[PDB]
Design a protein around this ligand. Structure first.
Ligand SMILES: Nc1ncnc2c1ncn2[C@@H]1O[C@H](COP(=O)(O)OP(=O)(O)OP(=O)(O)O)[C@@H](O)[C@H]1O
Ligand SMILES: Nc1ncnc2c1ncn2[C@@H]1O[C@H](COP(=O)(O)OP(=O)(O)OP(=O)(O)O)[C@@H](O)[C@H]1O
Lengths: 87, 87, 51, 262, 87, 280, 276, 75
């Protein structure tokens, strides 16, 4: 709460865009596809569990510059998240 | 005179093309660009407000969007061609 | 005086920018949510003082 | 400067200039006497600035890698002895292809209204695609290929530019031959609509026609085609002049059955 | 409209135009606002030919194969009044 | 190191806009002339333009002599003094600096340790809210080593990377002022002096009556609905006497705003006549 | 009873919220190399692919916007050629870096890597029909010395049809076990995307990667979806899917892009599908 | 020695002779003013000093006058 959460919002902007990726390279070099923008050649910041992600995944992109910063668990779809039971 | 001609043209940057829906006053017309929108504009001093009516093709600047010049006769001789000897 | 206040307040902020519209998917932990702009893609955001 | 883009002209008022840039941004344009405007014509592409759209430098027609690929080796090795039956149809065919490639004087002395291409209709398995593997071999000319759906593509200007390239490329590198394997895709009919997916398809066909009716029987191309169907496709292709000569590839008679097995 | 104005000031003159069954398109087959071209292109045709006054310095011809496929929303009653088959 | 006014001569500014706007959309760059003072009034005198290859986002100075061949051509008149800074333009994008700007600005400061950059944004620069601003870089070397005096005045709340980046490396952002004198403001306002004909031109009447018995027609309909709008108005609450009637064209004002007006422009039309009568 | 819900959601206004995305414990001090890695000579690029190298360097962006550009420090004449994926700046569009051709995710989401468990000894004693099956698949890959020397070019394509509950898919998940080469599990749901001429693009790339590889084979399933018949209707709302399958049949039999790749199908409606 | 002026009007004077290499000269202002010579433009009477034709063919006498210029780029 004193050091970790004080740094991320320092480099992670307030808006973190979202997208996908079609291919990856080791050493923090990767690629993105997305609807609003064209593709990109992009680096990584090395706190994402780098040996996790995969093609077809979803991502957390810094806004001013593109940069793969984090990844979400599922972000599958809303309607499937409706049909489940809560009550 | 050639090398002095061309610079006399390069300052005259390009324009944008539209078309009219209707008319409202000599101070305000309506247009419809060739890339979607239906702007509202004004008009320069020189061109006759008479000739400006519906159907016409038009040209104007990029920032202020003020109409200046007209080009009729949307030629397409592959489309039609006269037969004067038919007279 | 309060007349000229309004119009001088109002005119101050028609110069103000636009404002978009979108819908919620879920909420990230706190001071962090996500939105899809209804024509277009996603944008994590922050929030303001009030909400 | 170097970073600039490409466009395509459409007209010249009166010097003057107009364009249709690649970004879908038309411009009317006061006169650029930079390049000699009489040194170009409509649809003759040109360079142009990024902010002040003005003609800056012409440039050639650079074709796409997905078209040059369709240029072919002579990997086909199938002589007309490898095929049975069909002594007629191949006899009828080659009286449209190599002789106009070599011995067109028998036409040109008469100057008759010459043929431009062919068509090979009939059912699955009569030797359609095979025969084109053969004719590309025996003749001492080039040869080209394109499945039809190789043409259609997502983006709204991806197809038509592709086809204007090939025929243009074939007017280059001439004399040439074209092969269109499954014409049943594009050539169906007029599927009337305003949607995207319904227009971009047929608008390719509208280019193909203008390409057929753009050249003459002097330049030595010769197109053909193929299909499993004729009760499905648009007769405008069958109009007199474009694809006139036809071949009703039948099923084989019982004598032909003896050749094929041997 | 340019095809008529050009035709006007070169009065008298005749028109000819084939494949006329293409203006129909949807022919308002669904009334969606995507076929405005296939709709209006019939409109401007009709409004203009009504504007002749039928004085005797401009006349019009049309043709196709499928008059049963024609669009009698107009061109039936009084515009293309005389219908003429051929052997 | 604060409280630094930056006076500007009005002959300087409007040259900054005109060449700063004529090149639009592509941006544009020139120079400033002036003279430093002890610390506070880093004035400005006059400007000019280096030749250049302008884009919408980038530009350099092509020739490296037209700024040197001209100062030496100026001192024959000596109408100005030496150089003090340089400007540039961001045509529609906001007022700030970029990594290119500093690299060139970082030369001027070490060359001369108070030189200044200037930024302008003519597109959104309407007849009111100009947005011009100037800047002096810092020594971030001096920062990590780690100033106000009883007044600061004005700070910004916009231009994000002039608002969160506008301090950590950009500059000790710094106000401006204008040296509008009497000797020039006289020659300045000489546009709006209409004419000596421009106060007794009794213009045509054929719109006047077409406005007079047109205006009264437009009076009644708002009056006789204000005649409606006083029916009892004591209905269901004190706020219900107010908030059930939104301000959708509040009537009584709307007639008064034209009552006075048609009076105010007719009273001139009558008076002006009798005065014009005694032209003879 | 109507007080509980007041107290129950009263808990929802007590805890707060919690969510995470990623992170790491041991190398918790990542954040000294990041910022120095950020603004340096590791800007992003905006990809494209060339079309011509005129003795400059035309390009075509993904979206239709074509430029003509130059270089910085990257080698102009030699390393580059036509074709490849590349790197372009975001500001003024110079070339800086190549990178290889595109490999769509989906087809690599479509390859199988972990081998299932069944065998032809777990099948339900349909002893003959397997023999017609494997004789297509594996013997031309293990014992071609028989088929070739005697003088027969083996077949390169099967089809399976029978009523349900009968084990059409069983014998096919089996052979992947005894493959001795790769296998593919084509998901028919990815060939019908709602952008024209797209699914066909996925078909041909499905094979460009195949013949790259050696001795691939393929398992469709329920091709009644894709290999349906043809017709002409001015509604014809199956118009598009027809244009996909033509990416297939033109690719299976014409001008031999094929080497050694075999095919496998499956159905419950073998009458409707097109004769081709 | 030699004189050098600026666009500001400031003067700097250097200790050199007719044997001077522009790649060595350009380092001299960097010795004092701290300028990479990429941002440099020296002038002698309208003739920009090309780095190739070293000063031996420029008549750089004693107490001669030059003019320094900084490059300008923005965006
Ligand atoms: N008349 C023939 N002579 C020799 N071989 C033949 C003949 N007819 C069919 N074949 C055999 O059939 C195959 C060629 O079939 P063909 O190229 O006609 O298919 P197709 O009708 O083109 O299919 P599609 O029409 O769907 O493209 C070859 O393998 C060839 O051995
Ligand atoms: N011959 C068999 N021996 C043992 N089990 C079998 C046999 N045939 C079918 N099964 C059972 O049926 C299942 C698969 O049946 P099958 O392969 O016929 O499905 P399918 O025909 O592909 O289904 P669909 O027709 O809907 O595609 C297996 O899980 C297995 O339990």
């Amino acid at each position: 709460q004193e050091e970790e959460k004080k740094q991320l919002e320092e480099i992670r902007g307030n808006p973190l865009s979202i997208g996908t990726l079609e291919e990856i390279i080791d050493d923090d070099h990767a690629i993105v596809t997305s609807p609003t923008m064209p593709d990109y050649y992009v680096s990584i910041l090395s706190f994402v569990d780098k040996e996790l992600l995969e093609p077809g995944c979803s991502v957390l992109l810094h806004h001013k510059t593109m940069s793969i910063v984090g990844v979400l668990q599922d972000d599958a779809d809303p309607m499937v998240s409706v049909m489940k039971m809560d009550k | 005179d050639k090398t002095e001609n061309d610079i006399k043209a390069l300052q005259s940057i390009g324009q944008l093309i539209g078309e009219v829906m209707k008319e409202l006053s000599e101070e305000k017309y309506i247009v419809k660009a060739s890339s979607g929108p239906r702007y509202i504009v004004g008009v320069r001093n020189s061109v006759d407000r008479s000739k400006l009516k519906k159907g016409v093709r038009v040209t104007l600047d990029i920032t202020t969007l003020t109409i200046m010049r007209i080009l009729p006769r949307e030629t397409d001789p592959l489309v039609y061609n006269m037969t004067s000897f038919e007279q | 005086n309060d007349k000229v206040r309004f119009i001088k307040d109002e005119l101050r902020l028609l110069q103000e920018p636009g404002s978009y519209v979108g819908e919620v998917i879920k909420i990230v932990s706190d001071k962090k949510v996500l939105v899809k702009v209804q024509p277009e893609g996603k944008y994590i955001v922050d929030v303001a003082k009030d909400i | 400067q170097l970073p600039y883009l490409v466009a395509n002209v459409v007209e010249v008022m009166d010097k003057a200039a107009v364009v249709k840039t690649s970004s879908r941004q038309t411009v009317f344009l006061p006169m650029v006497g930079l390049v000699d405007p009489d040194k170009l014509k409509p649809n003759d592409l040109v360079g142009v600035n990024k902010d002040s759209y003005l003609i800056l430098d012409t440039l050639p027609s650079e074709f796409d890698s997905r078209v040059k690929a369709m240029e072919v080796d002579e990997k086909p090795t199938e002589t007309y002895s490898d095929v049975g039956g069909l002594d007629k149809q191949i006899e009828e065919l080659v009286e449209a292809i190599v002789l106009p490639m070599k011995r067109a004087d028998k036409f040109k002395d008469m100057g008759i209204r010459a043929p431009k291409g062919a068509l090979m209709y009939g059912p699955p398995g009569t030797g359609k695609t095979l025969l084109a593997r053969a004719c590309a071999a025996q003749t001492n000319a080039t040869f080209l290929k394109l499945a039809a759906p190789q043409l259609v593509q997502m983006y709204i200007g991806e197809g038509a530019k592709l086809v204007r390239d090939a025929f243009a490329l074939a007017k280059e590198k001439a004399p040439t031959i074209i092969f269109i394997d499954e014409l049943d895709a594009i050539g169906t009919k007029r599927f009337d609509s305003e949607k995207s997916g319904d227009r971009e398809v047929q608008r390719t066909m509208l280019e193909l026609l203008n390409q057929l009716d753009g050249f003459s029987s002097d330049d030595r191309v010769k197109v053909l085609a193929a299909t499993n169907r004729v009760d499905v496709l648009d007769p405008a292709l069958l109009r007199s002049g474009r694809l006139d000569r036809k071949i009703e590839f039948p099923l084989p008679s019982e004598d032909s059955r003896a050749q094929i097995l041997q | 409209r340019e095809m008529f104005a050009y035709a006007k000031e070169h009065e008298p003159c005749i028109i000819f135009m084939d494949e006329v069954d293409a203006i129909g398109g949807r022919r308002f087959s669904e009334g969606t606002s995507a076929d405005r071209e296939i709709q209006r292109t019939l409109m401007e045709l009709l409004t203009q030919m009504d504007g002749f006054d039928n004085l005797g310095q401009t006349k019009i011809i049309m043709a196709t194969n499928r008059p049963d496929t024609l669009d009698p929303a107009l061109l039936r009653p009084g515009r293309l009044d005389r219908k003429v088959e051929i052997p | 190191d604060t409280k630094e006014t930056v006076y500007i001569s009005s002959i300087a500014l409007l040259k900054m806009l005109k060449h700063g706007r004529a090149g639009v959309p592509m941006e544009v760059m020139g120079l400033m002339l002036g003279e430093f003072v002890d610390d506070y009034t880093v004035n400005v005198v006059d400007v000019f333009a280096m030749p250049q290859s302008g884009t919408g986002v980038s530009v350099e100075a092509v020739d490296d002599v037209f700024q040197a061949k001209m100062m030496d051509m100026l001192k024959q008149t000596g109408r100005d003094q030496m150089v003090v800074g340089w400007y540039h333009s961001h045509p529609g994008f906001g007022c700030w600096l970029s990594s290119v700007d500093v690299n060139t600005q970082k030369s001027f400061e070490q060359l001369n340790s108070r030189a200044v950059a200037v930024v302008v944004d003519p597109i959104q620069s309407v007849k009111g809210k100009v947005v011009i601003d100037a800047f002096r870089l810092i020594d971030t070397g001096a920062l990590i080593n780690n100033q106000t005096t009883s007044n600061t005045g004005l700070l910004n709340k916009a231009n994000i990377q002039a608002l969160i980046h506008g301090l950590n490396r950009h500059y000790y952002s710094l106000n401006i002022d204008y040296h509008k004198t009497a000797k020039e403001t006289k020659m300045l306002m000489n546009l709006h002096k209409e004419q000596w004909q421009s106060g007794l031109k009794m213009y045509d009447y054929e719109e006047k009556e077409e406005s007079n018995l047109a205006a009264t027609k437009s009076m009644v309909k708002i009056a006789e609905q204000y005649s409606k709008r006083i029916e009892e108005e004591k209905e269901l609450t004190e706020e219900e006497l107010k908030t059930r009637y939104v301000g959708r064209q509040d009537p009584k004002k709307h007639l008064s705003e034209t009552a006075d007006e048609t009076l105010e422009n007719n009273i001139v039309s009558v008076l002006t006549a009798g005065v014009n009568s005694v032209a003879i | 009873e109507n007080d509980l819900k007041d107290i129950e959601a009263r808990i929802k206004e007590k805890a707060g919220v919690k969510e995470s995305d990623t992170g790491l414990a041991p190398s918790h001090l990542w954040d000294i190399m990041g910022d120095r890695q950020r603004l340096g000579e590791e800007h992003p690029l905006q990809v494209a692919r060339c079309t011509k190298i005129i003795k400059k360097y035309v390009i075509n962006l993904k979206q239709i916007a074509k430029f003509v550009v130059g270089l910085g420090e990257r080698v102009s004449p030699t390393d580059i050629e036509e074709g490849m994926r590349v790197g372009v700046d975001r500001s003024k569009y110079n070339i800086e870096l190549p990178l290889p051709p595109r490999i769509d995710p989906s087809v690599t989401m479509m390859t199988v890597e972990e081998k299932p468990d069944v065998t032809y000894s777990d099948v339900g004693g349909c002893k003959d029909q397997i023999e017609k099956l494997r004789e297509v698949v594996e013997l031309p890959l293990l014992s071609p010395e028989r088929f070739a020397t005697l003088g027969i070019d083996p077949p390169k394509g099967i089809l399976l049809y029978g009523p349900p509950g009968t084990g059409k898919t069983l014998c096919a998940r089996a052979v992947a076990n005894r493959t001795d080469a790769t296998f593919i599990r084509v998901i028919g749901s990815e060939l019908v995307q709602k952008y024209v001429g797209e699914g066909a693009r996925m078909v041909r790339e499905l094979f460009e990667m195949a013949r790259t590889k050696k001795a691939c084979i393929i398992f469709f399933d329920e091709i009644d979806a894709v290999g349906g018949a043809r017709f002409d209707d001015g509604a014809g709302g199956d118009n598009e899917v027809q244009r996909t399958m033509l990416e297939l049949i033109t690719q299976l039999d014409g001008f031999d892009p094929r080497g050694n790749i075999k095919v496998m199908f499956a159905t419950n409606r073998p009458n409707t599908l097109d004769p081709a | 020695q030699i004189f050098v002026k600026t666009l500001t009007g400031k003067t700097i004077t250097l200790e050199v002779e007719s044997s001077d290499t522009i790649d060595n000269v350009k380092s001299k202002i960097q010795d004092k003013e701290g300028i990479p010579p990429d941002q440099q433009r020296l002038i002698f009477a309208g003739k920009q000093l090309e780095d190739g034709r070293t000063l031996s063919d420029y008549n750089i006498q004693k107490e001669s006058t030059l003019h320094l210029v900084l490059r300008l780029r923005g965006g």
